[model samples]
Target: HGELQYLGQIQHILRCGVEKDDRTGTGTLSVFGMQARYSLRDEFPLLTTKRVFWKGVLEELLWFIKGSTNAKELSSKGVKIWDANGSRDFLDSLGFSTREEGDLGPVYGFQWRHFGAEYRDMESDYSGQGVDQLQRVIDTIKTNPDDRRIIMCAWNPRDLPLMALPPCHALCQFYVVNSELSCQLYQRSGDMGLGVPFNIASYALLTYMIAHITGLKPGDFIHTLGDAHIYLNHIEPLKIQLQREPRPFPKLRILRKVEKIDDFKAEDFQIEGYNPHPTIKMEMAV
Candidate 1:
């Protein structure tokens, strides 16, 4: 269901997008904007046309919930999605020579859990630091469901210089209606081929986790993306994926009783009925 929307979006982009330069020195077929809605009611929006690395998705999101700024936390589990950006070469290229490798300073999770938390580096303990945006969102969802301001933001201009990379999936807002929790995320940019698919599931699962802990039914995940682009090298592989038909989305089942969002572990999540096509290997651009 949601996979078709993604495929259509890609087809439109490949046809109408302009060839542009990427910061990584690669070429891209870039588009200005795109949006998609994935239903999280009874199914998880894990990509079925081409298999998504579910283990990586779960572990990475859990790491974010843990408010970790180090990429090594993920790499230690063999989930090397952030390894490229955490390398010394990439850090040096970004003019952060002294910053330790794997220290993605004040990134997505740090901003999520601690908004104004004074970040020095990955090693700093932010126990009671900045505003807890994620917790505030949950509290608002529970206490004042109709507050009209249940938002979790990650784009912090003040801390931009310290970040290994500025936030891309920048801001996301949550809504409660009819005992259902829905989320709408605004991402500044997305790597449509490799990044967008995982992000779709990422936010959807985030919505799921919050809904589970907050005692609400999961509704929908609306993704609004700016500068949606596909890497030049991923064109052929993506085209092959686009040719494949979509399969039915799988249902997500939470095994244990999790009281808080931070209490969630990778083992608690289980996806059933997922039979995706073989992986379309696409190298990531750092």
Candidate 2:
């Protein structure tokens, strides 16, 4: 069953959680609790509705690979998800100081590229490598199954002092069993209703990329979380989506056959067969 009724049902359940909590003070939206398992041989799972800003997500993920601390590139693409808190405009709502240096340092990008103890002589080994762990896991699954320890870390405690906000999906690890690659993402905190959608697609795309690079097909994406909750304000939007009928699950087509991870561009990705309601806007938490 592709794009089954459960997707919307899961969204509704998250909405109920927000309504029950009565926690409406923060701008943080709710996180939808969903565990999407798909066979990579069938189709790529990208959220069909609400226009996921695929290009922006792709570019932002790529930027993280580059170990960028600046939000300039992300802001230019109209992705202000992280613009708040210590950014140029001093988004105080997010509670961070604009004057602080390295306040918004590389964050996920920094850890992904340069992941060890910071020494003057130690440089980012994969600083310019472009797209590190996703592809490596795929190759390992095929060639070296015995060498298990395939993972990607985005959260660095050292960088926390420099970040306006810490990474949510902090670390992710992949395990291969019976030739199937399973990914488990550990999110420190999750806004159950809004952020979860993007998180699902983002990791799903990562899964697809790995599947493509490696011979193994896409497997189960197990998402483990801490403090997963829904925001009180997003109830109305949730009701609206519940009222509408969901369209078919779309197929994502990555145009180019990219060998190196850094070579991928926004134009390389495309989504077809998405049928969903109009776009909805939800505020980002600090």
Candidate 3:
């Protein structure tokens, strides 16, 4: 029911959204200020309407947890999601000559692990330069679960110009209530057909991982979007998606005990009972 409701929102936007041009030159049907909520306790929120590459999702999440800015690491793990943005040509187009083939300049992981550091070229070492916001947030959740300041941010205005792609999921806050941990994400932009589904599952897995480390039961995942849109090219695939029925949401299983956030690897995550529809491929608007 959770994923079905989420799919319904997409249909709603298609029916009534306003048409607009975007950065990628792909036109869009957009609706501003939309929100979706999923109860993690009930289901994993992996879209049953379409098959999500769960391995890629978890690998990307782990890469962020490791605070890496290199797409090579993700690529080595067989996740090609970042390949387009991390391409050498894309990096060169942004006037960055020092970046390697897969170096995503101060992207999500770098910002998550180091929020306020001066971002030099990708080759330069940034070992202890900035605030470790992710570490601090995890510590706060463990020691002060009720604190309203349990938040992790990836929107660094200074580094945005240098990044291969500025983060879509910019800010997130966690809440612990009644011994359950919940999360809310504030995304600046969402590509409804391609990016939104991944964002939902990524953040949901993030919440689950954090809760596992902090010893709290997983609760609700609330996602708030700023500019939610469906690309003009994605309309047909979305129509096909709408006609399909949503199966039950899957459950996430952790194989071994992870003592710290950084200790968890992609192998530790296992998706169970995920019988989703076939994959829907859509070209990303870079």
Candidate 4:
């Protein structure tokens, strides 16, 4: 039901949203201010309408946990989602040079792990110049669960100019209520067809992992978006996705006892009972 509602939200945008020009040169059917809620206790929030790449999602999340700015690490782990965005030509177009093939300079992971740090390209040493936001949030959740300041942010205005792309899911705050943990993510931009489904799964996984580490039950994942849009190129495939009926939501099993958040690997995650409709092919808008 949750997954179906999510897809319906996209369909709503397709029917009612305004056509607008975008930065990608591909136009968009855009809407503003959208929200979706998923109960993590019931299901993992992996989209049932289409077969999502679970391994790729986990590997990408783990890469962010490791605070890696280089795309090679993700590529080595067989996650090629960042390859297009981190290409040498893309970086060169932004008037920057990478030390290696896929150095996405100071993106999400870098910002999450090291906020306000001096990022001197992907190869430069970034040892101790920034605050560890992820560690602080985790520690706060463990010790002071009632603290309202428990937040992890990836939007650094200073680093936006240097990055290949700005953070979309910019900030997330955690809350603990009666031994249940809830998370709210504020995404400034969402690609309705391709990115939203992945974002939903990734954040649900993140909430579950945080709850596991902090000894709290997984609660709800609240997603709030500023600009939710479907690319012009993706409209047809997404329409096809809408025609397919949703299957059952999957269950996520953590195979190991991970004391530290950064210790999780791709192999540690297992998705059970995920039987969704066939995969939908949608081109990303860069």
- State the C-alpha lDDT per candidate: 0.91, 0.61, 0.88, 0.87
Best by lDDT: 1
Give the per-residue Cα lDDT of candidate 4 at 10. 82
Q: What is the TM-score of each candidate against the true structure?
A: 0.98, 0.77, 0.96, 0.97
Per-residue lDDT tens digits of candidate 3, residues 1-286? 8887678778888999899999888899998998888999957999988898887888889888877888888888999889888897888988876777888888898888778778765556677879998889889999999899998999988877888888999999999999899999999998889888889999999998889898999999998999989999999999999999989898998898888788887778888899999989888888
Candidate 3: stretches off by over 4 Å: none
Give residue 221's error in model 4 in angstroms. 0.2
Q: For candidate 2, write residues 1-286 as lDDT tens digits.
A: 4344335444545644443342335643334444445444456555554555566667667666556656665677777665554365553434543444223654676667655535121122444444455446656666776666888887777656545567889988887777666677888776755676767667767766665566556676666656566555665665565565656567777787767566666787777776656787766544
| Model 1 regions lying over 4 Å from their true place | none
Error of 3 at 279 (Å): 1.8
Model 2 poorest 10 in a row by lDDT: 119-128
Q: For residues 1-286, what per-residue lDDT tens digits would candidate 4 score against the true structure?
A: 8886788778888999999999889999989998888999967999988999887888889889878888888888888888888888888888876445577888898888779788877666665768889889889999999999999999998888888889999999999999999999999999988788889899999989988888888999999989999899899998888888888788999898888998887788889999988888888877
Estimate the lDDT of model 1. Answer: 0.91
lDDT of 1 by residue, 1-286 (tens): 6788899889998999999998988899988877898999899999899889998999889889889989999998879999889999999998999999999999998998889888988988898999999999999998999989999999999999988889899999999999999999998999998889989999999999999888999999999989999999999998998899999999999998899888888889899999999988998887
Candidate 2 regions with alpha-carbon error over 4 angstroms: 1-39, 89-103, 117-139, 177-180
* TM-score, prediction 2: 0.77
lDDT of 2: 0.61
